[PDB]
Amino acid sequence: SIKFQALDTGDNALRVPGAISEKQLEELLNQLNGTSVPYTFSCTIKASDPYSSLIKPQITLLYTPRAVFKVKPVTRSSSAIAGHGSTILCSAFAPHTSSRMVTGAGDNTARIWDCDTQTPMHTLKGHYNWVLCVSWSPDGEVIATGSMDNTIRLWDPKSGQCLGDALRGHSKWITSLSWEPIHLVKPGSKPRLASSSKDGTIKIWDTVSRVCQYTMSGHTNSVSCVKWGGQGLLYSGSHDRTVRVWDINSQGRCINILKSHAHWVNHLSLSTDYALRIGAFDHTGKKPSTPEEAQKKALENYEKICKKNGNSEEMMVTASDDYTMFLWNPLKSTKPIARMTGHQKLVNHVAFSPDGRYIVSASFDNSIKLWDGRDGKFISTFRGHVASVYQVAWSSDCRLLVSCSKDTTLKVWDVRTRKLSVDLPGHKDEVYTVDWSVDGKRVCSGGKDKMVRLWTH
């Protein structure tokens, strides 16, 4: 007996024919919808791997088109790659290729790696304190590093050369970096860089003319994080218990102060920021032929995720150290749409899925909770870690989620089945960073053991 159900969710009815050829199963499913459209079929949904399945001891058959891209779950680990002098604090794949990756460690250096050969490629020297955040520009041309020495440095990913002098201005350490989205950038020009500091300011940097355009001081305390949205609006969170909204088309004018939080705002993420990070690029790796094509492609990829109701809504999630999270639709209302709660310990990372469909939150209660990205409803808790969870990373197809932890392991989860997919140990100590490449081919992790691990399917 066999039943047909899509990976989406739809059941489409009940049939029993004896053990058949795989090619026939398409033809049958095709024959129903009169597509006569290739297909791949799934079953045992751990397991998750597809009469040979009856040589292994009724059946539901999960079907999905071949033309639809699907990221394979990471399974194995290369040999650990040495280079950094102390613990690794941040990591980020390039938006246009899975052959490049950058890390930031407490040895005052950032490193660019060749993921194809698992070798060190460049060492970025110039900061006189810890590198706290690394972020590729959405066109993949420039790397920026925010440091504990209060400065920002721009690097060339290909040559490893620092682009002139550091960006100076902040009087305390850098808390976050956020590049201007490609679809808002005038064709032929480059994306500007927003940075937040513990000094309580947000600066907007012109990386080309090499000049600071605006300084958004307004928060009365340290600024925790900033995010450059696709409407020409920036959203910042701060220890003044406030979420502020700055209009870049009005010289950084504050158009809204959100006071619903009762405690320090620690994390702030948008539903569109996975899209914003990679601009015109996707899982294929195909490059735009012209800057004008890049702007159109970036807009197309952006409007695809935000414009659902015929209008553009980017949702916002903010977290505080009362463990409480909020969901916003800032364009629509200045009051929280929903109040997410349940975490018993501090939330360390919050991220929407690339389609904005889900919200996942990593905590120090050794758990990861899955939330609905449109109304903020609780769905499930990912249990399996024994120690605190530091960071998570989404797959491009929004189907898989990898998470690193203090428990010396990484775990990848199947968000469709809401369960553990594969548990991969490897490191010798705590792991602080994880990232998943756009093509889904490679996963990188780095932590206390000063070493980089590259994970593949």
Swiss-Prot record:
Keywords: Nucleus, Repeat, Ribosome biogenesis, WD repeat
UniProt-listed SUPFAM superfamilies: WD40 repeat-like (SSF50978)
Protein location: Nucleus, Nucleolus
Chain intervals for the UniProt region annotation (Interaction with MDN1): 1-70
GO cellular component: nucleolus
Annotated S-S bridges: none
InterPro entries from the UniProt entry: G-protein_beta_WD-40_rep, NLE, WD40/YVTN_repeat-like_dom_sf, WD40_repeat_CS, WD40_repeat_dom_sf, WD40_rpt
Entry function: Involved in ribosome biogenesis. Required for processing and efficient intra-nuclear transport of pre-60S ribosomal subunits. Interacts with the AAA-ATPase Midasin (MDN1/REA1), which is essential for the ATP-dependent dissociation of a group of nonribosomal factors from the pre-60S particle.
Subunit structure: Associates with the pre-60S ribosomal particle. Interacts (via WD repeats) with uL18 (RPL5). Interacts (via UBL domain) with MDN1 (via VWFA/MIDAS domain). Interacts (via WD repeats) with NSA2.
Name assigned to this protein: Ribosome assembly protein 4
Source organism of this protein record: Saccharomyces cerevisiae (strain ATCC 204508 / S288c) (Baker's yeast)
